[PDB]
């Protein structure tokens, strides 16, 4: 809340008043210009709105508006709030309200809370839940993990249609080829060899560019995961290389490797690393881990790829990184030993923000159905508490919320609404981990801080696994929950070596779990989000210092405090700048959180003059620690 | 025949010996690199190979290795001998007895006839035919003729699929695209309008390049047939514009204007020019000249597009072929009031070469079924005559080629398939216009070289017409003939409004015509190939001059000899240059061969130094010439 709350206002001044009528105005739209009915609300959701009238305009709590951060708003406004005709025909409230009774239907109590809750600043969906929640397409959904079908012509357009057909509505888009053959491998068909993947490639960065208004965005944020021992590999690692004058421009694909640890085992064994057209070496992104190992292995033996030094790659990888901040790395086998899906197959990518991390085969399209819940506001009492039954309480609302999206989800292909269906994926989110930890005034490094976070996700992986128990309880269990690890009784933290943190009831949960089933594979997909220091500002006046004598230490510097003047230890140990922070406390807590993660979530460790073996001891600890996403991004300057 | 046939008969030497073993050799044949059975013969031919291997090695006549141009050969040994391991495996006699055999089976009788004429330079296929022949994927077509099948992204993603999944095999491709609405027009899923073509463009253009490394061919020569009511028309003509800097670096898309004779009427009576997104003018690619003008004449009524000078679009257009010789103009009522298939629909595009005139629908894509006759190889006896019987005579046979092929074609997409074999679309070509004249020592504009001419087609269109009867006659008319032009004895020239030049007997034609039908809807589409002055060199001996003391005049200039010191006029008449041959007369020589020409042809006038204006009277003139394909290039400097 800054001097500007007048936006808000004075702009909730040529708004329209009653819920009710809003709607009306929205269903009853007309195209002026083409003259075409121009709903933006469903039938179904319309009528539900009628039907109730009374008891939701009524529920609705308007002064709530003014409770929105300034540059929030602005997004919402901007963005968010369905306009009229050029003109915004929403208040934030009507937005939330739409949401709301976008996931339940007649469910109308469960609607109005799901209301309170996210108008109290709580929690929040999505902005694909956001934005066409409640509309007559309503696909609220956020990515979409999508499989390279074929590696024949009949198969790779039949791909492309996909990544267009979703990439017209919908959201982010993630694809794995490491079955496409390598460069100047063989067609049977004719004198031709293959062109590789990067041409391939620059066809998918293409259908990317044109299939885009309508997915209100040019930014066309694919991300393309590739195991690094396709022989295409050190093609694919280059892509977004600041050199290439007849290459990919590829301004919005994205590569990720999808990495064994085999390699991770030979680099640091310094060694071989063989490379594969995949025709010539098939069932190689189907294996993994030991059965990975013989596997490979043998083709090593066999003779059949183009052997290089483990750390020639390695080396060439890094050096894209930094250039370019790519690829992305997540590992392989870490992902699919700790996953929940085991059972139905190998899990081939994760996607672009490197968190969500579920199964996807050529008629199975993985769906991110995600709600993020605001950390800050369980803060409780001068200084203060962190209230953990509320947040159990509020996550196990958020699962059930994300659960409906998924039956009320308006699928753009086929393939997503299966795969959605059988299994059930949600990713609760968080917001304000930082937050938090400096209201409650700890510092980033507090061996207590440390503590915290894991009690949190603890807690939220724990409702958020009870919230699904009873719906299957109620519903029954998601499709395909037989061999789950959970259809054993085996869970998140189970599958990395641990205890809980047990601060929860692990025992009567796990129980019931085996009794009940569960209504989703997965549940949580935390960090990476922004719209789904100002900290300081507020500390410095009860000591002294400030403004007309002091324009001056931050607006100059990145908000790094650390010997200045008259300025508290306290303080300069709680505002603490990121690259100050240390790293392997960073991954740490990372690989703490990582426990109770039925999905992955990623790092951005923060280094300065990061070196070709600065970032290797980063990877390799991480690595080691038996984390999802390996490191996902390196920012430098 | 020239001083380096030496490169034919000492590489005669590096070649095995009889047919049979070279067919072995060819079929038996594996990837030296992959081990794989690498058959060049499909079993179906090779075993007719073996079960007459007698007749065959005995019929062949290897002396005719010889009788073959210099740059000819060159042409055979580079690209159409099948190469063993990157050795030359096929002495021509091999190449064309197996492509002979390609066309019949067991037909033996007709498969060395057909070997003889050929190996005897009187006819030959198509390239696709030569190349592939024979071998396990027999398709033998040149060119397709695709529809844009819908204006969703479901239709241009299936359209896409197609124009890689032939372009992948097969030739060149020719879509047309007036369904495709215009910029900036509207979606009814979300607030997107349209990106227009030229993106869309940009995407065809793109699975142009990466779809090639089997198509044996980086180029990509498709072209895009348009209306010039297409409110994207401008933008349209405008691809290969020499300037672009974020746009169509379309170095193999090439623009094709579909034009109505509204255009050129508007234009001429200098007037108005309406453009319209499809969407709010649908049907307009389905009617035609009267149908068509109701329609548009109305939608102008309505105001629904957006009025131009018609001059403008006219003015930019030409400006446009100057600059880069492009688009290309077919005159889209010339085509369909004059096609025999106007009983299927309403032909909406031509093809690159712009030749062939024949229907294609979102589930018919048309074929360039080919062969091409060499006009000089019938002029006979000090100076001659033309054989007009041996003519008819050739001319008969290469329609029974064709029409095998159409049988025996490996399709591409059973579109293809569909179309191909309903309808049965020739294509007799004819090689040696420009020759046969200057043999029969007859000059360019002789107005008996004019006679001639006319004659020639004349004698095609009438056998490939009565062959075609016959199989009619044998095997059944086309499978859609009823409703036929011919199905009423309306026949080429008949459609114009001609009669024959009657040196062969229509009416006994018409006659059978109507009763036993044809067995091809289509028969020629005469001249735009070349691999499918040397002519003074002989004359200067007899009268005088020459080398040591004249490595002079033309050696300089463009074979240009008007007023060359001692040089007679009878030369200087005959070998006149192209640029100074008269235009109205080749244009009109055109619209005399017109008449006989099921399909259509193109023209390439000449002239230096082309006005906005000069140009215009040449494509006013064809234009009311009543020629098919307008003007479809210019050549300047
Ligand atoms: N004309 C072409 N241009 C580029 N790549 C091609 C072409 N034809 C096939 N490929 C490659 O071959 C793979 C797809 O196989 P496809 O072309 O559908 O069957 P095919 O290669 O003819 N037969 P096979 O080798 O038996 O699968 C892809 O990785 C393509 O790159
Ligand atoms: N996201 C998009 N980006 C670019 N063009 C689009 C997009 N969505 C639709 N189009 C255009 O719309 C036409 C195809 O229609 P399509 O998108 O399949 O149905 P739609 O527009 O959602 N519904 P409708 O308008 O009722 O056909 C093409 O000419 C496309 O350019
Ligand atoms: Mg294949
Ligand atoms: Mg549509």
Chains 1, 2 share one sequence.
């Not at 694909?128 to 979409?144: D, E, I, R, V, W």
């Not at 594969?276 to 596997?295: H, I, M, N």
């Amino acid at each position: 809340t800054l001097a500007a709350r007048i936006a808000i206002s004075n702009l909730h001044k040529q708004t329209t008043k009653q819920f009710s009528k809003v709607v009306e105005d929205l269903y009853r739209y007309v195209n002026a210009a083409t003259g075409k009915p121009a709903p933006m609300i469903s039938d179904d959701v319309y009528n539900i709105v009628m039907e109730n009238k009374d008891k939701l305009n009524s529920a609705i709590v308007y002064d709530r508006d003014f409770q929105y951060s300034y540059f929030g708003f602005k997004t919402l406004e901007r963005s968010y709030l369905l306009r009229i005709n050029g003109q915004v025909a929403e208040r934030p409230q009507h937005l939330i309200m739409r949401v709301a009774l976008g996931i339940h239907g007649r469910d109308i109590e469960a609607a109005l809370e799901t209301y309170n809750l996210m108008s109290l600043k709580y929690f929040t969906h999505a902005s694909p839940t956001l934005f066409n929640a409640g509309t007559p397409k309503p696909q609220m959904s956020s990515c979409f993990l999508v499989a390279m079908k074929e590696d024949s012509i009949e198969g790779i357009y039949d791909t492309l249609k996909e990544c267009a057909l979703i990439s017209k509505t919908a959201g982010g888009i993630g694809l794995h080829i490491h079955n496409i053959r390598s460069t100047g491998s063989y067609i049977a068909g004719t004198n031709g060899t293959s062109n590789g993947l990067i041409p391939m490639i620059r066809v998918f960065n293409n259908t990317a560019r044109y299939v885009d208004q309508g997915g209100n965005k040019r930014p066309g944020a694919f991300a393309l995961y590739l195991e690094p021992w396709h022989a295409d590999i050190f093609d694919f690692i280059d892509i977004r290389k600041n050199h290439g004058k007849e290459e990919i421009r590829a301004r919005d694909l994205f590569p990720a490797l999808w990495i064994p640890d085999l390699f991770m085992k030979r680099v640091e064994e310094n060694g071989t690393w063989t490379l594969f057209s995949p025709t010539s070496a098939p069932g190689l992104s189907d294996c993994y881990g030991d059965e990975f190992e013989a596997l490979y292995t043998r083709y090593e033996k066999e003779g059949r790829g183009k052997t290089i030094k483990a750390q020639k790659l390695w080396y060439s990888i890094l050096e894209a990184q930094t250039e370019t901040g790519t690829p992305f790395v997540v590992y392989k086998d870490a992902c699919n030993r700790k996953s929940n899906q085991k059972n139905l197959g190998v899990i081939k990518s994760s996607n672009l923000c490197c968190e969500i991390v579920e199964y996807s085969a050529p008629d199975e399209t993985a769906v991110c159905n995600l709600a993020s819940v605001a950390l800050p506001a369980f803060i409780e009492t001068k200084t203060s508490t962190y209230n953990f039954k509320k947040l159990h309480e509020i996550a196990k609302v958020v699962t059930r919320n994300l659960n409906r999206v998924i039956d009320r989800n308006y699928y753009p292909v086929e393939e997503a609404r299966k795969s959605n269906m059988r299994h059930r994926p949600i990713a609760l989110g968080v917001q304000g981990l930082a937050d938090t930890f400096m209201l409650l005034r700890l510092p980033f490094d507090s061996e207590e801080a440390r503590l915290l976070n894991i009690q949190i996700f603890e807690t939220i992986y724990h409702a958020s696994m009870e919230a699904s128990c009873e719906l299957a309880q109620k519903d029954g269990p998601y499709e395909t929950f037989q061999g789950s690890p959970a259809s054993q009784g085996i869970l998140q933290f189970d599958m990395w070596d641990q205890k809980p943190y047990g601060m929860w009831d692990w025992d009567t949960l796990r129980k019931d779990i085996m009794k009940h089933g569960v209504r989703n594979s997965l549940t949580m997909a935390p960090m990476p989000t922004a719209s789904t220091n100002p900290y300081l500002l507020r500390d410095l006046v009860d000591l002294g210092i400030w403004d007309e004598g002091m324009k001056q230490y931050l607006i100059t510097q990145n908000g790094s405090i650390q010997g200045l003047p008259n300025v508290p230890q306290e303080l300069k140990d709680l505002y603490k700048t990121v690259w100050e922070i240390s790293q392997k406390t960073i991954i740490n807590m990372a690989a703490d959180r990582s426990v109770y993660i039925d999905q992955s979530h990623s790092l951005n460790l923060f280094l300065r003059a990061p070196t070709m073996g600065k970032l290797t001891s980063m990877h390799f600890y991480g690595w080691k620690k038996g984390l999802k996403t390996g490191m996902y991004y390196l920012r430098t300057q």
